[PDB]
C-alpha cells in the first residue's frame, strides 16, 4: 500500500504554500491517515534529493530543522526556507529553528 501512500503524501506536500510549512503529523491527518505520521516521515525520507516536491516545507513539530552538524540536506532546507521569507534563528544547542505557529500551513 505504501507505493500509493507515498504519492498521496507527495501530493499533499506539493500543496503547502510558498512561505509556509507543515509536519509529518499534520500531513498525515490532512490526507486522512491520522495514524500514519511515521509512514509520512518514511515517504519524505525516501525522496530523491533532486525531487520537485517541496520537502523543505516539512519540518518537525518542535520547529527545528537541524542539529549542530548541519547536514547538506539541513543546509539546503535552511537555504530554501529563508528564500521563501521564513525567519530562522539558532538555538543554544546549535539547531536552526523557527516559530512554527507563525508559518504553520492551515489547509
Swiss-Prot record:
List GO molecular-function terms, semicolon-separated: catalytic activity; damaged DNA binding; O6-alkylguanine-DNA binding
Instruction: Give GO terms for biological process.
Output: global genome nucleotide-excision repair; transcription-coupled nucleotide-excision repair
Q: Which CDD domains match?
A: ATase
Write down the InterPro entries for this protein, in alphabetical order: ATL_DNA_repair, MethylDNA_cys_MeTrfase_DNA-bd, MethylDNA_cys_MeTrfase_DNAb, WH-like_DNA-bd_sf
Site annotation (Required for phosphate rotation/nucleotide flipping) points to: 24
* UniProt KW keywords: DNA damage, DNA repair, DNA-binding
Does the keyword field hold DNA-binding?
Answer: yes
- Where exactly is the site Critical for recognition of O(6)-alkylguanines, probes the electrostatic potential of the flipped base to distinguish between O(6)-alkylguanine and guanine? 68
Q: In the UniProt record, does the keyword DNA repair occur?
A: yes
User: GO cellular-component terms in the record?
Assistant: cytosol; nucleus
Q: Would you identify the family this protein belongs to, as annotated?
A: Belongs to the MGMT family. ATL subfamily.
Miscellaneous information on this protein: Does not have alkyltransferase activity. A tryptophan residue replaces the cysteine at the known active site of MGMT.
Q: Which PANTHER family match?
A: 6-O-METHYLGUANINE DNA METHYLTRANSFERASE, ALKYLTRANSFERASE-LIKE PROTEIN 1
Name used for this protein in its record: Alkyltransferase-like protein 1
Q: Which organism is it from?
A: Schizosaccharomyces pombe (strain 972 / ATCC 24843)
